[model samples]
Target: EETLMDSTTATAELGWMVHPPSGWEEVSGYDNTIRTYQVCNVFESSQNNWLRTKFIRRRGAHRIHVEMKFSVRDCSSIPSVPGSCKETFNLYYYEADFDLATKTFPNWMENPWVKVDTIAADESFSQVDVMKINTEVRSFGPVSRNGFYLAFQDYGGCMSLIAVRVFYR
Candidate 1:
C-alpha cells in the first residue's frame, strides 16, 4: 500500500500536471483589469498537445461547471498543409481513481474521457473581444470521482485564455 504520511504527501498524491502547447505564455495585461495566457500557431505543435489542469479531488460533488475566459485571432502565417487549418476546438472532462491499497491509478484508458463541447471562433473577433465558454452542469453530470481532469485543445490560430474556474455542486 502507498504510504500517506502527511498533508504534503496527500497533496502530492492528488496533484496532476499541466501540458500547455509549446508557444503558450502567461502575459500581463495592458489594462489594469486584464491578465491572461496566450498561445499561437497551435498547429506548430503536436495535434495531441493540450492545455490541461492538475488533477483535483471533487470533495463529494456530483456536477461541475467549467468556465474559460478566452479569445481567438487569425494567424498571420497560414499553414501550407493539406486540410483546413481552422478546425474546431474541443473540451474534455475525465475522472480517475487512485487505489490506496496498491498505490496505483487504474483503468485510465478503459475510462474514455467525456467530451464537454466543441467550439469555433467568430467571423469578426479581436483580442479585446474575448470569448467566454461557460459549461452547464448538465453537459456532464453524476460526477463520481476521487480525481478529475480538464483539458482544452485548439486546432489552429492565436488563442488566449484569461482564466479558468470550476464549480461543483
Candidate 2:
C-alpha cells in the first residue's frame, strides 16, 4: 500500500490545502473519550467549505483511499448529542488543471471531474467518513498539470474535523 499521507499533525505542512484559505482553520484538541490528542479542521459555517489536497500524480494508482473523522455539536455545544451535526460532506476529484478544476463543482461529469457520493453523521459522536476515488481520466486524454486534486466540501451544519488519512499507491 502507498501512503499519500498519514497525519494528525499540521495539515498544511503535510501538503493539504483548503479553499477560501480564511474559511478553514487547523484545530487541535485532546479527546477525553477517545483518549488521544487530535488535530482537525475548524471551519466557519458548515456549508461550502472545502479541504483540498496538493498535486497527487496518478502514477497508475487506480484507487484513492480517504478516511476522515469529524465531530458534531448539539444545542449545548459541547459535543452534546449523536445526531447533533448535520453533515452533508461530499468529495470530488479532478484530472485537470488548478484553474479549470477548481471552477468545476459538484455535477454530472462536469469537466470530467468525478463526484463521489455524499456523507453525513447518522451515528454517534466522532463521525467517520470513508470515500473512494478512481484516477482514470481517459476523457481528458491524460492527467492534468498537477495530476490529481481532491476537494472535500462539507455542506452540513457547523462542525470540526477530527483527523484525516489519505492512502493510495
Candidate 3:
C-alpha cells in the first residue's frame, strides 16, 4: 500500500478571527498573528458562550463588501445553549467587512447586527445595512452574545459565510 501527501488547499477570499469574550481565557491560538480561525473561551459562564470572528476577502478591485442575511429558526426550532436553553435571554447576528490596500482587503470592520431580542417561539429575519469600505482602516465588532453561537449567510446562496475564495489579482 502506498500513501501520498499533496499540497493542501485553502479557501480563497476569506479570513477568520476571534477573541475571548470578557472574562474567558484563550484556550488555544493566543498571541498569534491573524490566521484562518481563532477560538477562545470564557470563565465558566455556564452553558453561555461567546465567539467573535473577523473575516477577510482578498479579491475584487481592492474593496470589501458583503451582505449578511440573518435568519432565526422559528421559535421552537431555534437551537438553545446547552447548559441553560430555557434561560436564554437573546441571540444575535453580527458581521462586517472592509477593504484594506490593493494588496489586500482593508482591515476596517463594521458590525451590523439585529437588535438584541429575546428568543421567541417563531422564525424571524434581520438584515445588515448594505455597506462599503475602502482599503485603509476598518474596525468591526466584538459582537456580544447573551447566550452563545450565531449563524451567517453571505454573498449569493453560492457561498457560505465561512468559506474563502481567491482569484486573479
Candidate 4:
C-alpha cells in the first residue's frame, strides 16, 4: 500500500484544515504525564464541527483505506452527561473536482458526502484515551470524480482530532 495523505498534530502543514474557517480552534501542548509529543486537536464547542484534508486523486485509488486517530470529551472523564459519552464523529469521503482551493461546499451538509464509519471516543478530562477509526471507502451509490477529500464532523460535545492518514491499493 502507498500513502495517499498524512496529517498530524506534529506540524502546521499536514493539509488538515478546518471548515467554516472559524468553526474550530487549534490546540497543542505537552506534559510529562501524557508524553513528550502532543497530538494536534481541533477544539469545537459550536454544537458541531467540520474539517477536510487535502484531496487525493481518484486515478489509482480504487481501493481506499482511511485511518483517523482521535479522542472526544463530554465530561472529560467521569460520570457525566449520562448518554453524552456515547456521542461519536463520522468519517466521510467527498468527491470533488479538485481541492476546490477557493470554491468548495459552503457547509458539510451541502456537499455530497459518503459515510465511511462512525467512531467512538474516550471521554475524560484528567485523562484521555486515543482511538482510531479504520474503514475502507466504498460506494453507497454511483460515484465518479477526479479526486476526493477525507472529512469528519462530530455529532456534538467537544472533540480532539489527533491525526488522519489515508492509504491506497
Per-prediction TM-score: 0.59, 0.55, 0.22, 0.62
RMSD of each: 8.3, 8.4, 15.6, 6.3
Model 2 gets an lDDT of 0.47
Q: Which ranges in model 2 have alpha carbons more than 4 Å from their true place?
A: 9-15, 29-47, 74-86, 96-112, 122-146
Candidate 1 Cα lDDT to native: 0.51
lDDT of candidate 1 over 1-169, digit per residue (tens): 1111112232222332324336355565544344455566644544443555556567666776665555655453444532435545567877776533111332222246577877655454334433443222224677786767766666565666655666653
The sequence of per-residue lDDT tens digits that candidate 4 reaches over residues 56-147 is 77674556667555555445554444343335676777776667743455347634667776776543223334343323233323336677
The TM-score obtained by model 2 is 0.55
Model 2 is weakest, by summed lDDT over 10 consecutive residues, at 131-140
lDDT of 2 by residue, 17-95 (tens): 5555644555434332221121122333434556666556655645666665555433345354234234355667666
lDDT of 3 at 158: 14
Better of 2 and 4 by lDDT: 4
Q: Which stretches of candidate 1 lie over 4 Å from their true place?
A: 1-23, 30-35, 42-46, 75-83, 98-111, 121-138
Query: Largest TM-score belongs to which candidate?
Result: 4
Q: Could you say which candidate leads in lDDT? A: 4
User: Number of clashing pairs, model 1?
Assistant: 0
Sort by TM-score, top down from the best = 4, 1, 2, 3
The lDDT for every candidate, in the order shown, is: 0.51, 0.47, 0.25, 0.53
